[PDB]
Amino acid sequence: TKLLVSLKVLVIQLNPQIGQVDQTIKRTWSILDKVTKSATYVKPDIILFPEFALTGYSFHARKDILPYVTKKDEGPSFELAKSISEKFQCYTIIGYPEEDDEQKLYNSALVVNPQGGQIFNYRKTFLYDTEMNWDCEENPEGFQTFPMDFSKCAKLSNEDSYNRDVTLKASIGISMDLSPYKFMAPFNHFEFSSFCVDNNVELILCPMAWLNSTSITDKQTLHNNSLLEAAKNKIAFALKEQGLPLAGSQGIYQLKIGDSQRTPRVPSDDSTSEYKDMDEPDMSNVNYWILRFFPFLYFKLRINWFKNSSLIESILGKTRMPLDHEYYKDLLDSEEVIKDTVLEKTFLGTSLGQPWKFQGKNAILVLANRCGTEDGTTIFAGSSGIYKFNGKKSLDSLNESVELLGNLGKGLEGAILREVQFEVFR
Numbered sequence: 001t002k003l004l005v006s007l008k009v010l011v012i013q014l015n016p017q018i019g020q021v022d023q024t025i026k027r028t029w030s031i032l033d034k035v036t037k038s039a040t041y042v043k044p045d046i047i048l049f050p051e052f053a054l055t056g057y058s059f060h061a062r063k064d065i066l067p068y069v070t071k072k073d074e075g076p077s078f079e080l081a082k083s084i085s086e087k088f089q090c091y092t093i094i095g096y097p098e099e100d101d102e103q104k105l106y107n108s109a110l111v112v113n114p115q116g117g118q119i120f121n122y123r124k125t126f127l128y129d130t131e132m133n134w135d136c137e138e139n140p141e142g143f144q145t146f147p148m149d150f151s152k153c154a155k156l157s158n159e160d161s162y163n164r165d166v167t168l169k170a171s172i173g174i175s176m177d178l179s180p181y182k183f184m185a186p187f188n189h190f191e192f193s194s195f196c197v198d199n200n201v202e203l204i205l206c207p208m209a210w211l212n213s214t215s216i217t218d219k220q221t222l223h224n225n226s227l228l229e230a231a232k233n234k235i236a237f238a239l240k241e242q243g244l245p246l247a248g249s250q251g252i253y254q255l256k257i258g259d260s261q262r263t264p265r266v267p268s269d270d271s272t273s274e275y276k277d278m279d280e281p282d283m284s285n286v287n288y289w290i291l292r293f294f295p296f297l298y299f300k301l302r303i304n305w306f307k308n309s310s311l312i313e314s315i316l317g318k319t320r321m322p323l324d325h326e327y328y329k330d331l332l333d334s335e336e337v338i339k340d341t342v343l344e345k346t347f348l349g350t351s352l353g354q355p356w357k358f359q360g361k362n363a364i365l366v367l368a369n370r371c372g373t374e375d376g377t378t379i380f381a382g383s384s385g386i387y388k389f390n391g392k393k394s395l396d397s398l399n400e401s402v403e404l405l406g407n408l409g410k411g412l413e414g415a416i417l418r419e420v421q422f423e424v425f426r
């Protein structure tokens with residue numbers, strides 16, 4: 001049986017600065033208030049916030065992030081998501097700094113149902129250089145999936161309305177999860193992308209604090225005060241020329257609610273990474289974000305790979321997580337049988353029994369990336385948007401195996417709403 005699902009996704013893009021939690025709370029209610037007053041407004045089934053959407057991101061010490069850490073079921077972040085879910089009758093996913101009863105710190109993103117009850121708490125699996133500053137911890141469970149009960153969102157292929165309930169097998173990824181492990185692992189791996197394809201993920205939620213390539217990331221520059229001074233002056237002029245403060249744009253909201261304005265497919269080049277046109281998305285990152293989801297993208301060479309039986313040594317040898325990951329604290333030789341899970345495993349989008357496993361299926365990707373600037377050196381690309389993988393039969397936005405349902409600006413706070421329509425198999 002094949003169910004048709006119609007979901008109403010709402011993504012919030014904020015510019016949270018460290019020490020302005022309450023002010024970010026106020027601006028958030030200001031955005032949601034404007035969203036409901038939209039001409040083409042509809043009640044969202046799921047609302048997604050960026051990574052650390054209320055506290056800020058660039059923390060340099062554990063002592064600094066301590067005043068903002070909360071339990072998974074306590075604090076401003078949890079209270080906000082609970083109020084939103086109860087006020088909109090939807091799921092709320094927001095990134096927050098977490099701390100357990102063992103005094104351990106995490107980069108987490110909590111989830112609340114329409115009833116106002118926390119149904120899931122996810123920890124960041126792959127850590128970024130910034131998490132190392134405040135002694136963050138890798139997700140001991142690694143990549144995870146969870147079910148989401150949506151009411152009146154599905155229907156049969158011959159019905160005239162969505163009066164049926166559907167339990168989607170969701171999955172959350174936090175920025176660095178999309179990148180190669182520690183920026184050192186092979187690019188061809190695609191950890192998080194493979195994990196979602198392997199476990200047949202249908203809805204992908206990605207809270208992010210992704211950077212713009214114009215940011216200062218060079219290590220020898222960040223630790224050379226002479227070079228760092230001249231490097232920060234460049235960032236200062238970049239924002240001053242745009243008529244923006246060093247912290248970034250706040251208060252001025254970009255609202256794309258209800259409209260069906262799709263994002264233009266543009267290839268990567270020079271000036272696609274330039275921090276200009278704050279109402280326009282960052283196609284350099286959008287193309288990169290799509291590339292990181294290669295297993296969901298159509299690729300012609302998969303036929304030759306499956307035929308020549310390539311990657312099978314990669315599929316079998318493929319482990320769940322990196323061996324040196326916190327997750328851990330030959331079938332060809334053995335006489336043990338091949339389990340279903342092994343046949344579900346994939347590499348580069350190819351499986352042991354099929355050239356393109358995702359082929360024929362659909363999946364919804366929701367990226368909620370923050371905007372603004374921090375430390376006068378870190379610029380976030382923003383460009384929050386929603387994507388659809390049709391799985392129908394090009395390693396960027398030019399590939400028509402993915403649908404760009406809409407994106408936000410690279411440097412403006414706002415919220416985008418889209419009525420995503422895909423299909424599922426039960």
